Amino acid sequence: TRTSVLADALNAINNAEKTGKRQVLIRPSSKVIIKFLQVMQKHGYIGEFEYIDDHRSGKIVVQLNGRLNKCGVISPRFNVKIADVEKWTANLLPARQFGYVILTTSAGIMDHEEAHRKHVSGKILGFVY
Amino acid sequence: GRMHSKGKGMSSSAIPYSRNAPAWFKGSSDGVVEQIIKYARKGLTPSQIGVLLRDAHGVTQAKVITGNKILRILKSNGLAPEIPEDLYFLIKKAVSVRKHLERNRKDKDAKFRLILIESRIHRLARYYRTVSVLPPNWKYESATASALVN
Amino acid sequence: MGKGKPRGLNSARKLRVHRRNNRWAETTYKKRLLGTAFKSSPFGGSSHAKGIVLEKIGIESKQPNSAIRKCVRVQLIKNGKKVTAFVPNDGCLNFVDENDEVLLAGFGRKGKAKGDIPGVRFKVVKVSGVSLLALWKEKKEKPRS
RNA sequence: GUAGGAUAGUGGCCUACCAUGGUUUCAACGGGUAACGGGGAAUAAGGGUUCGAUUCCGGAGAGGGAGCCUGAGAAACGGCUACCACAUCCAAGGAAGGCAGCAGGCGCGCAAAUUACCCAAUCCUAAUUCAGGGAGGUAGUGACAAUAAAUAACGAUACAGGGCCCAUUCGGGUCUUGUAAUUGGAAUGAGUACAAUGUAAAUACCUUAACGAGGAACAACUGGAGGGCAAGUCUGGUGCCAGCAGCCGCGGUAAUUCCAGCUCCAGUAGCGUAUAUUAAAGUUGUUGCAGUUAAAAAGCUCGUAGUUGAACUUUGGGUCUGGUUGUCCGGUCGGUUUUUCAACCGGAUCUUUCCUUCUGGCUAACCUGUACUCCUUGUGGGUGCAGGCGAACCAGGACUUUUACUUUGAAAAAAUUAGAGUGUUCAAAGCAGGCGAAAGCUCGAAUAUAUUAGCAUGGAAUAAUGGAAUAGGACGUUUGGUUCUAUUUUGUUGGUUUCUAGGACCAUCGUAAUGAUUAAUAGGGACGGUCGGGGGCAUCAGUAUUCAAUUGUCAGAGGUGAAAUUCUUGGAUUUAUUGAAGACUAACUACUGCGAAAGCAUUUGCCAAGGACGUUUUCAUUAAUCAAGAACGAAAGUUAGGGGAUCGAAGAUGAUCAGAUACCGUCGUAGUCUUAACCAUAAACUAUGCCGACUAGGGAUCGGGUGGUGUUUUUCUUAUGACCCACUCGGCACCUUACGAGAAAUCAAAGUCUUUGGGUUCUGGGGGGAGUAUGGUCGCAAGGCUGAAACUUAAAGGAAUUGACGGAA
RNA sequence: AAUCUGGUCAAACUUGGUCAUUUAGAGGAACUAAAAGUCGUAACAAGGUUUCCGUAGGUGAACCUGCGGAAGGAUCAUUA
Ligand SMILES: [Mg+2]
Ligand SMILES: [Mg+2]
Ligand SMILES: [Mg+2]
Ligand SMILES: [Mg+2]
Ligand SMILES: [Mg+2]
Ligand SMILES: [Mg+2]
Ligand SMILES: [Mg+2]
Ligand SMILES: [Mg+2]
Ligand SMILES: [Mg+2]
Ligand SMILES: [Mg+2]
Ligand SMILES: [Mg+2]
Ligand SMILES: [Mg+2]
Ligand SMILES: [Mg+2]
Ligand SMILES: [Mg+2]
Ligand SMILES: [Mg+2]
Ligand SMILES: [Mg+2]
Ligand SMILES: [Mg+2]
Ligand SMILES: [Mg+2]
Ligand SMILES: [Mg+2]
Ligand SMILES: [Mg+2]
Ligand SMILES: [Mg+2]
Ligand SMILES: [Mg+2]
Ligand SMILES: [Mg+2]
Ligand SMILES: [Mg+2]
Ligand SMILES: [Mg+2]
Ligand SMILES: [Mg+2]
Ligand SMILES: [Mg+2]
Ligand SMILES: [Mg+2]
Ligand SMILES: [Mg+2]
Ligand SMILES: [Mg+2]
Ligand SMILES: [Mg+2]
Ligand SMILES: [Mg+2]
Ligand SMILES: [Mg+2]
Ligand SMILES: [Mg+2]
Ligand SMILES: [Mg+2]
Ligand SMILES: [Mg+2]
Ligand SMILES: [Mg+2]
Ligand SMILES: [Mg+2]
Ligand SMILES: [Mg+2]
Ligand SMILES: [Mg+2]
Ligand SMILES: [Mg+2]
Ligand SMILES: [Mg+2]
Ligand SMILES: [Mg+2]
């Protein structure tokens, strides 16, 4: 089966980056995926991206900037209790300074810093450094 | 990538972009429905009916022209069989396999195939039960399977 | 590759079970569990044991280095089992004598042999209430016979 | 369950009668624990792992098990009664006992203190200021553990190192450092000791007088001195010894490793050894390992649990309005208040938008306008009440899709831990202290953690769940009804029926945009032409061997590994026609095809099934992998049947070699082959689990399917067929760089892994002992599945590199 | 008050039965260690019959030999 569509997409993106492609084609194209992409854009890791309407599920194209290094996805969507966020960041991200840990929460799909600012955490999706 | 075999093909029907009607290809929805009903009465299964519609007449999909599918339409009318079509087919196949086995005691591959078919049927049956079409506490197996079939 | 172990968010019990199962390949863990020290291991899973010197026995060493290693056949008091204890430093065996009480210790290897002395697992420490090293030194003297 | 009985009371607690339940792979039940539970302890990046007899909280027990008195409270044991086990005292008739209180003894053991002093404190009990208290404190022993630190310091003279005024050679040495049993002045408390302090009394501490340091003491040990690993290629004694050595190892007459001196290192009032245990161990892995070959992918597929599982439903814009730090000056007496500005976090709203809705209480407010004006020429400003904005709160309905997740909160005893304050002289600590006139006053005794479960609230992303598809659906000016229920007044009771206001339930009328998301390059199923050494049953060939028949021809033919044995001649062999039997099914035959693997190649037929494909067909989550269990499963073997040609484990037998029941050789029971039962194993090997996705070129090659005024077939156009070429999807298959990998062989997967997480099953944790012992279980057996430890050992392996070698080329 | 009729709780005992853990134990049959024993030369070089694996049968010991399989093979090779 096609489990974690988002994860697959992320993997594809990573592969593309490794190759030195300037853009990616993604099949399934979810809400979560879209959110992630938006977040990335906000941060400054991704160019344009466009949702094709296959009169069906979806189909995204992402413009890679050459800035992404890894665009990871942590596997089961672990339940993060605000203090554990720091730990997670330490585990995943290079440096206290930079990078993000994209985690869904009540407020919306946001990065770790954003969540902290809000004062609202939840379940992790991925990361970007 | 296929349920039972290790053959991972994509022999598949594409479907067109427009959910709306393919303009020129005319007729009427009501007429189509009537035709479907007639087919059902005659004995054609939903898939078969659909195929018929496709082949000679100007229908592409019922989903497009009517809005409704075919099975749903049949149900509305009062024409969908007690056992859903695919399931029925599977049962028939199983029965056939059993018969073959009976005829020829020594046949291992055949037996295996039969077993597989049975398993498939069971799965399907379970699914149906979960849905609520076939009533619960009911196994569609082998001895009574034949009876069910005919 | 998902890599063997179940990565689901509710796959925890299974994981635990697997871990438990694995634990029985780890030797130390197994020993701890089954009480191999408490059921075997001449000592009672203890540091030391007092034992009676049944006889002085020179044991021929393993290989490379060739020599006789002046051991003692000791009978442990608490259990009644019979073991062989190497006796350290020059002489020492004379000091130990015969039919004396002798406080043994493990040789070092958590059981097992100690280098070259084959079938030998214990240092004699004290002979009839002194200390072998001390005796060797002559910092302390023996309490007569 | 019903009823009783009992109990302080609930209750199968017990009794009677009835029912057949109850728990369980989300491990019930059983077994083990060298298991009392928790607070906590050790370790310490994060995650962890181990320990918790033991100062606090609970629980048990008083040699064992039982029973009970008294009592508010005991199934008490410093109460009793019994029995068992142990034991005392005896004039033998009989009595008394219970340290797992304290002290102490034995006993056991590697392993643990005084038969001391007292209620002064701490608290406790009573008839109770007053007594008692082995609870408790006080010492004693005490290197359990922890904290603080003496074991000379400063001189001078006497011999050497370093700066140097200058270096014709010196040297003063004007300036600074180290060495000498010189010597000299100055302390010191470790010891002792009047005193005074302490104290219940004492000790000891802190405080003091007095004596007490000069190598002879008022004396530091332990381990090591090749490496790991800080430090001796010093000297002798030794000479495979004796010994050290965790491991590596040292020892065989030149030991830097043994045994002594000196030196020297390390740690230091401590340091070693032993066993545990934690770290190191990503050598138990969730974070975070391995499985092509190092240990590791079940031979294969099926499959319930479990674990997981495609995308789709409210997005976006405006309009104000609270903050919160940087800014703009300090507007100020190093601190404070706005603006020019900011990002950031909210709140209200409006956007086709409800945030749960009403029956009523309070309608705060003006949406107001009833008299219109206290009044700068005014819409600056409010005495003011009929219609009425309700969010400003309640206090009751109605009924909530339900979770998980996360938020802040309330609760998670103190000690511990983290941690603020503070001069125990310092600290380990401790909860103290601090400041006056020093007549009284005065700060403290914080805060944070603990995330398991429950409670509380906000959030609505993520993940599930739910709803209207016989709409028995939703609403409501429905209009009928049906069943109610039922209080309030008719004086108050018992009615009956109303008006009526609240249930509930079938009608019919209306209202609305009336109600199904996709149809996953997910999956199933139909359809279509196909494909195949896929399976079963049925026949055909070649035959080929063998025996036999008839047929012919007269010395040998078989066999050989170099060589032999071995057989017939009364033509064996050889030549030619047959027959019987059961085998097998070449050539075809390939980096070819099918099958879940095992496996499957002559014929035709039959019998079903199957992938790929094509499909504007159909269902709509049926899906992925799997411990229980299931289906198959090479060969051999097995039982039981048929055959048996050859080869051919057994066995005969002929050579060879020191020998050789071994090859080689000749023969050749069992089988081999088959049919009916089993068995369930393999280098069942791609030594590569499955599903999924993505990353780099190339040609082919099989099976489908498109397009080519292409070519040929030729029966004139043909139309099939068969190619050519291009693309297309599909399984049994090369080259380079690898940036991806990998220990490397190599790998386009064995890649997208310390930049560690797509979804799952299974397996492995040094080698051996051992696939053994044992028990299970499965079998006719042989064996299979399952599966130890003791003990042993420093390597076992892998990959390659150079060699050496090989009756390899 | 002794005394006493029935219950009830029930220690324990007697003789059996049973599970666990211990522990004597003649003999057996193993495995491990050790440096110099005996008969072979199985494997490693095509190790002098290529190795294995499964399986039967045999043997004095390696082992042999059927059958099927594997190459970790002693071959990624024969075109027409
Ligand atoms: Mg596929
Ligand atoms: Mg499957
Ligand atoms: Mg030697
Ligand atoms: Mg009752
Ligand atoms: Mg415990
Ligand atoms: Mg216990
Ligand atoms: Mg405890
Ligand atoms: Mg104990
Ligand atoms: Mg207690
Ligand atoms: Mg006792
Ligand atoms: Mg008692
Ligand atoms: Mg007592
Ligand atoms: Mg008491
Ligand atoms: Mg005592
Ligand atoms: Mg002690
Ligand atoms: Mg006490
Ligand atoms: Mg003392
Ligand atoms: Mg001092
Ligand atoms: Mg020393
Ligand atoms: Mg030494
Ligand atoms: Mg030395
Ligand atoms: Mg060194
Ligand atoms: Mg020497
Ligand atoms: Mg560990
Ligand atoms: Mg490992
Ligand atoms: Mg392996
Ligand atoms: Mg295998
Ligand atoms: Mg196997
Ligand atoms: Mg989803
Ligand atoms: Mg602290
Ligand atoms: Mg013959
Ligand atoms: Mg073919
Ligand atoms: Mg053929
Ligand atoms: Mg199984
Ligand atoms: Mg066979
Ligand atoms: Mg032969
Ligand atoms: Mg012979
Ligand atoms: Mg092992
Ligand atoms: Mg009685
Ligand atoms: Mg050869
Ligand atoms: Mg050999
Ligand atoms: Mg050989
Ligand atoms: Mg033999």
- C-alpha pair distances (Å), B79 with each of B88, B124, B127, C15, C113: 15, 21, 21, 51, 86
| Torsion, CA B81, CA B86, CA B87, CA B91, rounded to 10 | 110
DSSP assignment of B80-139 equals S-SS-HHHHHHHHHHHHHHHHHHH-S--HHHHHHHHHHHHHHHHHHHHHHHHTSS-SS--
**Tokens 């399977």, residue located:** B145
User: Is residue A3 within 8 angstroms of chain C, CB to CB?
Assistant: no
| Contacts of C31 by beta carbon, 8 Å cutoff, 6+ apart | C37
Q: How far is B139 from chain A (nearest CA, A)?
A: 28
Closest CA to A27 of A41, A2, A9, A45: A9
Measured CA to C1', what is the nucleotide nearest B117? D609
- Residue ranges per structural domain of chain A: 1-68, 69-129
SS3 assignment, position B64: helix
CA distance C64 to B23: 98
Separation of C105 CA and D779 C1' (Å): 52
Closest CA to A125 of A58, A33, A57: A33
Answer CATH for B81-150 from 1.10.10.10, 1.10.3720.10, 1.10.287.10, 3.40.50.12780: 1.10.287.10
Which of C19-37 are b and which e, b meaning 16 or more Cβ less than 10 Å from the residue's Cβ?
eeeeeeeeeeeebeeeeeb
| Contacts of C1 by beta carbon, 8 Å cutoff, 6+ apart | none
For A8, counting Cβ atoms within 10 Å of its Cβ (0-12 exposed, 13-18 middle, 19+ buried), the class is: middle
The yes-or-no reply on C/B contact (3 CB pairs or more, < 8 Å) is no
Question: Residue C100 has what DSSP assignment?
Answer: -
CA distance A58 to A37: 14
Q: At what angle do helices B29-42 and B46-55 cross, to 10 degrees?
A: 130
Cβ neighbours, 10 Å, residue A118: 13
Classify residue A66 as left (phi > 0), alpha (psi -120 to 50) or beta.
Answer: left
Please report which helix (H) or strand (E) contains residue A86, including its range.
helix A83-92
CA distance C48 to B131: 71
For C124, counting Cβ atoms within 10 Å of its Cβ (0-12 exposed, 13-18 middle, 19+ buried), the class is: buried
CB A40 within 8 A of CB A71: yes
User: Is residue A116 within 8 angstroms of chain C, CB to CB?
Assistant: no
Please report which helix (H) or strand (E) contains residue A84, including its range.
helix A83-92
CB C69 within 8 A of CB C10: no
CA distance A126 to C81: 63
CATH number of A1-68: 3.30.1370.30
Measured CA to C1', what is the nucleotide nearest C126? D110
Classify residue B132 as left (phi > 0), alpha (psi -120 to 50) or beta.
Answer: left
CA distance C84 to C76: 10
CA distance B111 to C40: 56
**Tokens 């492609």, residue located:** A21
CA distance B121 to B94: 8
Structure-token pair, residue A26: 């993604």
Domain A69-129, CATH class in plain words: alpha beta
CA distance C60 to B27: 108
CB C21 within 8 A of CB C70: no
CA distance A4 to A126: 12
Dihedral (CA of C43, C48, C50, C54) sign: positive
List the strands of the sheet with A103-105, edge to edge.
A108-110, A103-105, A123-124
Chain C interface residues (partner A, CB cutoff 8 A)? 7-9
- C-alpha pair distances (Å), C127 with each of C31, C52, C90, C133: 31, 10, 15, 10
User: Is residue A75 within 8 angstroms of chain C, CB to CB?
Assistant: yes
Chains contacting chain A through 3 or more C-beta pairs under 8 A: B, C
**Tokens 């980056």, residue located:** A17
- C-alpha pair distances (Å), A20 with each of A9, A65, A66, A67, C117: 17, 10, 7, 11, 65
Q: Which residue is closest to D597 in terms of CA–C1' distance?
A: B109
Separation of A77 CA and D407 C1' (Å): 19
Q: What angle (nearest 5°) sits at the alpha carbon of residue B130, between those of residues B73 and B92?
A: 70
Nucleotides of E under 7 A from a protein CB: 22, 24, 33-36
Determined by cryo-EM
For C50, counting Cβ atoms within 10 Å of its Cβ (0-12 exposed, 13-18 middle, 19+ buried), the class is: middle
